[PDB]
């Protein structure tokens, strides 16, 4: 179990760690988060009390280094940093826990929610999507645009997600225009799976990463990416059976975790009705359809 210590908490802030969150008051005796499960990526995220604008945060994996949070009064944000001096990292942390000023990652032992939301996400792959190579952790915020949004403006600060565009020459084989547009199997299986992603594991990892950025930061381009990746599968007549079964589980846990009061802005009515009720896979997502109909029957 790993620890993300804090220098101090000079400004009042709501702190998120994965699907959990808590409030820290200005200058409150707070030394960070302990007992973080090893083996999963994690996200630590922030919303300042005085400006709920800009949710922001950091994806990290404690196996990839010793990380601490330090408030920068010039840039006005809580920054993740790496302590290379392991000895010194170990030296600074022990005092805080004898002194008890850390919040404990509060995992219920029955609870596989975070595993189920991050099963295919890889921290080294996240660095490929969020380009800032000098750090082992990746910063994301509410305002960051995707490469596809920048084609329709700073490149260094963008979310490099796999570009998906159903009316593109990549998606449509010459001479199969109707076929490829009405059944996207070629685009899913040959172009995307075999060609770009390499396997479905990678496809699920980006799809899961896109959802979590939409949910935790209200990142609109990430929401667009999540829905496009769902729709590409649902609009394919030929999908490996194990991919459909896994997608059903992935979406079930995403819909289950979604805050009830954010469903209006995080769920695209057209895509979900099409996917559940008109698409090739309309009968293939039993768990997702059941939770959707019982939790958000308005959207449908």
């Amino acid at each position: 179990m790993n620890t993300v210590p804090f220098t101090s908490a000079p400004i009042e802030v709501t702190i998120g760690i994965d699907q959990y969150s808590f409030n820290v008051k200005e200058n409150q005796p707070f030394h960070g988060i302990k007992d973080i499960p090893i083996g999963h990526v994690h996200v630590i995220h922030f919303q300042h009390a005085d400006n709920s604008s800009m949710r922001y945060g950091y994806w990290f994996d404690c196996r990839m280094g010793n990380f601490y949070i330090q408030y920068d009064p010039k840039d006005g944000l809580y920054k993740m940093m790496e302590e290379r001096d392991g000895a010194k990292f170990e030296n600074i942390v022990h005092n805080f826990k004898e002194r008890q000023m850390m919040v404990s990652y509060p995992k219920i032992d029955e609870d596989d929610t975070w595993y189920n939301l991050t099963e295919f996400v890889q921290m080294d792959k996240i660095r490929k999507i969020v380009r800032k190579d000098e750090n082992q952790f990746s910063y994301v915020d509410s305002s960051m645009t995707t490469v596809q949004e920048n084609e329709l403006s700073d490149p260094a600060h963008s979310l490099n997600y796999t570009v998906i565009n159903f009316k593109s020459r990549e998606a449509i084989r010459p001479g199969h225009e109707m076929e490829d547009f009405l059944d996207k199997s070629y685009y899913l299986n040959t172009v995307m799976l075999q060609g770009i992603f390499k396997n479905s594991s990678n496809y699920f990892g980006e799809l899961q990463f896109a959802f979590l950025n939409a949910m935790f930061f209200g990142n609109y381009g990430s929401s667009l990416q999540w829905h496009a990746m769902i729709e590409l599968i649902c609009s394919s007549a030929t999908v490996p059976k194990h991919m459909l079964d896994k997608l059903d589980e992935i979406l079930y846990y995403q819909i289950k975790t979604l805050p009830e009061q954010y469903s209006d802005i995080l769920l695209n009515e057209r895509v979900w009705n099409i996917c559940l009720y008109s698409s090739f896979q309309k009968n293939s997502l039993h768990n997702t359809e059941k939770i959707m109909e019982n939790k958000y029957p308005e959207l449908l």
């Binding site: 009316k167 593109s168 020459r169 449509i172 225009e177 109707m178 547009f181």
Partner: protein
């Protein structure tokens, strides 16, 4: 974006453009079978592709053989239309290719956009105008070439005959849409108006009769009356 009454004169500027109407591509007669069920029999159809500035009509005849063994023919018809329009554009010299294609039905947008991905600079647009091009098969010479076709065929017509020698393309288009609106509202009456007088003939290389300027004014007035008439007969006004 969409074409409507506010940007109507754009049709007659010097940017090449084509209307595409797919109404008459997939045509059927519905009939009873010996067992008393209903079946369809396809008949030949046509794509109506029109340059509104020059009157050039690219009439692609759709022979019933293109439907043989195919499913969901109403959906296929939109994609076949888009395929044939794309083929037409590719067949034209670059300087003759359209800068915009205006489809008369919104269901043609995605099929045509997909077939024209190779042409990112050609704008594919809908329209809010209710154009009466479905009535093209009420023009006898167009109907004849469609129904006589034994194979796929493209035939080029000028739908304005020689009118542009005497009137502008705005006025020619207005005349054409009035004629076609009348033929759509009451085909028999419209055709009686157009042919009642046997001393005015249709030249072999024309579609419509050789009306003088003064005769066109009379004809045009009679078509307006017909349309207003039928509108009363229809709504009892």
């Amino acid at each position: 974006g969409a074409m409507n009454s506010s940007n109507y004169a754009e049709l007659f500027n010097n940017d090449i453009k084509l209307f595409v109407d797919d109404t008459n591509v997939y045509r059927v007669t519905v009939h009873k079978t010996f067992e008393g069920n209903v079946a369809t029999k396809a008949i030949n159809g046509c794509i109506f592709t029109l340059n509104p500035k020059t009157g050039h009509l690219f009439l692609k005849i759709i022979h019933t053989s293109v439907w043989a063994g195919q499913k969901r023919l109403s959906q296929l018809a939109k994609w076949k239309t888009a395929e044939e329009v794309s083929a037409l554009v590719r067949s034209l010299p670059k300087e003759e290719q359209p800068k915009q294609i205006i489809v008369t039905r919104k269901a043609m947008l995605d099929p045509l956009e997909v077939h024209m991905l190779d042409f990112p600079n050609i704008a594919i647009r809908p329209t809010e105008l209710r154009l009466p091009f479905s009535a093209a098969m009420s023009i006898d010479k167009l109907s004849d070439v469609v129904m006589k076709a034994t194979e796929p065929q493209m035939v080029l017509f000028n739908i304005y005959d020689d009118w542009l020698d005497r009137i502008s393309s705005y006025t020619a288009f207005s005349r054409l849409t009035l004629l076609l609106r009348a033929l759509k509202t009451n085909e028999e009456s419209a055709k009686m108006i157009l042919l009642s007088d046997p001393t005015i003939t249709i030249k072999s290389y024309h579609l419509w009769p050789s009306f003088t300027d003064e005769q066109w004014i009379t004809i045009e007035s009679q078509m307006r009356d017909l349309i207003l008439t039928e509108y009363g007969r229809k709504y009892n006004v």
